[PDB]
Structure 1
Amino acid sequence: MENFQKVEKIGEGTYGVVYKARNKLTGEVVALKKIRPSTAIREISLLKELNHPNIVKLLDVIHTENKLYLVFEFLHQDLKKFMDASALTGIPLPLIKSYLFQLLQGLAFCHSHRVLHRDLKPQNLLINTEGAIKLADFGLAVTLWYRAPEILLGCKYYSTAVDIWSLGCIFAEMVTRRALFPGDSEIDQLFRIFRTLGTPDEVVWPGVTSMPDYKPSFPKWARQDFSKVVPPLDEDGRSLLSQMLHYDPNKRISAKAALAHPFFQDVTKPVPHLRL
């Protein structure tokens, strides 16, 4: 817009390109989201008031000249770049455990407001030098990787639980430095989950066979041992991970319950080792 000097493009994806920009008035740097509807305008205002230490703050909404710009606070790194820069040693467990606990606090704040992220992933998870992690790119709702099985099976009325699955997958990625379910299409994605967690059924998931895209012809696979899936996560973590990865949306753990899981009895807030 005619108020922001665009320093550089930092993102793209579905709704729009995002930029590092400085407000010519104040001087402050921010993230400008160029989108691309009364309903959308009204929903966006809901988010303006949605405020929490772990949710990336939405500063201003500029619907002008029939265009939509969203102005957010800026953070220097996303989790994806940080995980890439730590591929060799991996992220320390206390750092991981701190980030999962903050991500859970945010998701627990959003959910009690009936707001879902729906597209959680490393790239829209932002971190600062002060050891804080924040949820970005939401309230708005190309990889299939962190997509919950109910969405892949045609369910239209998603639960907050789709988020918990995505987070679960992210958790397993930080620990193993390797993506859990790196499928490259809706069906390849579905078959990888089936291969690790076994093909679901009426016992493990009552109702699954009456889902839109369920096909009786799905090959039958056995569940693998979580010990082979997420080494070296201790029993407390593997426990929490399996409750976040439950096929049934209804049996999947909520962010509030996960907050009291014994895996966070010893949480702390170490500061990352980032290079900007």
Structure 2
Amino acid sequence: MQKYEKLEKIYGTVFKAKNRETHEIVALKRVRLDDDDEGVPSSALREICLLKELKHKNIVRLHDVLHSDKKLTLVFEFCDQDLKKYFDSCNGDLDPEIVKSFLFQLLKGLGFCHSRNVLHRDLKPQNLLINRNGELKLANFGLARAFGIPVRCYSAEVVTLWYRPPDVLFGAKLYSTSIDMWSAGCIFAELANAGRPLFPGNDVDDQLKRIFRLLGTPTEEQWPSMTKLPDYKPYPMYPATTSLVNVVPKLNATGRDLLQNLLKCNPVQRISAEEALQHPYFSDFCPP
């Protein structure tokens, strides 16, 4: 890509590179256009469309798109690591102020997406990029989509299992910005402990059990339309009385409250990104 010099490799292949003209360091994602495995370009094109319309300091920034040889080259701002590597770099042990800082930035980026009518749908630690300056960006919009139009349903099959909410596990075909708030709560739990998935189920049934066992099983009054969902099945009634204290030790009562607001099983009860940003957990803080 004449303009860019590939420095190192770090739906496609990602490289750290240098702009030969400004010497700025960028990330280049290459998308092969003559692939053997049909598909890929389709998701890259959706990502380009969304990312052109989502310019925010906490959303990974697309600078440009180059079409040369049998490839699409997406130029992004460079970020050194993803949250997974970050957990590895620091023994999975974040200072509470960094916990708060990362949740804050995550909510700002997510807040921005949702107010623009975009659902991310793939929030997980590897889709979260962290700068050496401490700046977090939501990345990887390959699974994202615009919403608002009248539709009979969306893909029932979105979000890696460990970050998928109960309504989607029960097969809800329509969902809103709530799906990302659930996944944000899961990530908050990783940050606030030792950086391991809160709910690592091996399949759907196991996943729902892990959730209910910690949070309590939702009753009919908290979630009236639950038993009507396409893949609803009776679960045991686990009690709502289990303490969250040892699950998220970096958090005081104020953070535990926010976590339970994000991790509500009934999607309509989940706190929105914007409300979460007005929660007392962020009351003092700084980056506002």
The TM-score, its normalising length taken from structure 2, stands at: 0.81
Tell me, yes or no, if the aligned pair for 1:18 and 1:33 is still in contact at 8 Å: yes
In structure 2, the CA distance between the partners of 1:122 and 1:24, relative to structure 1 (3 Å rule), is same
Alpha-carbon offset, residue 102 of structure 1: 1.4
* Pair 1:257-2:256 in alignment: no
User: In structure 1, how many angstroms separate the alpha carbons of the residues matched to 2:13 and 2:173?
Assistant: 27
User: In structure 2, how many angstroms separate the alpha carbons of the residues matched to 1:39 and 1:241?
Assistant: 32
Residue type of the alignment partner of 2:83: L
Deviations 1:56-93 (A, max 9, x none): 101112355664432211111212222222226x2111
Aligned to 1:205: 223
Aligned to 2:168: 151
Partner residue of 1:28 out of 24, 42, 46: 24
Aligned to 2:89: 85
* Pair 1:71-2:75 in alignment: yes
Partner residue of 1:215 out of 214, 223, 233: 233
Aligned to 2:36: none
**Superposed, which structure 2 residues align to 1:1-276 within 5 Å?**
1=1, 4-10=4-10, 15-24=11-20, 26-35=22-31, 36=40, 41=45, 44-63=48-67, 67-87=71-91, 90-138=93-141, 140-141=143-144, 143-177=160-194, 178-216=196-234, 218-223=235-240, 224-268=242-286
User: In structure 1, how many angstroms separate the alpha carbons of the residues matched to 2:126 and 2:25?
Assistant: 20
Alpha-carbon offset, residue 140 of structure 1: 4.3
Tell me, yes or no, if the aligned pair for 2:46 and 2:142 is still in contact at 8 Å: no
User: In structure 2, how many angstroms separate the alpha carbons of the residues matched to 1:17 and 1:194?
Assistant: 38
Aligned to 1:273: none
Secondary structure of residue in 1 paired with 2:76: strand
Alpha-carbon offset, residue 104 of structure 1: 0.9
Residue type of the alignment partner of 1:122: P
Alpha-carbon offset, residue 38 of structure 1: 8.2
- RMSD of aligned Cα (Å): 2.5
Alpha-carbon offset, residue 24 of structure 1: 4.6
User: In structure 2, how many angstroms separate the alpha carbons of the residues matched to 1:124 and 1:42?
Assistant: 16
User: In structure 2, how many angstroms separate the alpha carbons of the residues matched to 1:45 and 1:232?
Assistant: 38
Between the two proteins, the alignment pairs up a number of residues equal to 263
Residue type of the alignment partner of 2:8: E
Deviation larger for 124-133 or 137-146: 137-146
Alpha-carbon offset, residue 103 of structure 1: 1.2
In structure 2, the CA distance between the partners of 1:9 and 1:187, relative to structure 1 (3 Å rule), is farther
Tell me, yes or no, if the aligned pair for 2:43 and 2:143 is still in contact at 8 Å: no
Q: Which runs of 5+ in 1 are unaligned?
A: 270-276
User: In structure 2, how many angstroms separate the alpha carbons of the residues matched to 1:37 and 1:126?
Assistant: 23
In structure 2, the CA distance between the partners of 1:138 and 1:37, relative to structure 1 (3 Å rule), is closer
Moved segments of 4+, more than 6 Å? 37-40
In structure 2, the CA distance between the partners of 1:112 and 1:190, relative to structure 1 (3 Å rule), is same
User: In structure 2, how many angstroms separate the alpha carbons of the residues matched to 1:121 and 1:231?
Assistant: 21
Q: Which runs of 5+ in 2 are unaligned?
A: 32-39, 145-158
Tell me, yes or no, if the aligned pair for 2:43 and 2:142 is still in contact at 8 Å: no
In structure 2, the CA distance between the partners of 1:2 and 1:203, relative to structure 1 (3 Å rule), is farther
Calculate percent identity across the aligned residue pairs. Answer: 58
Alpha-carbon offset, residue 26 of structure 1: 4.6
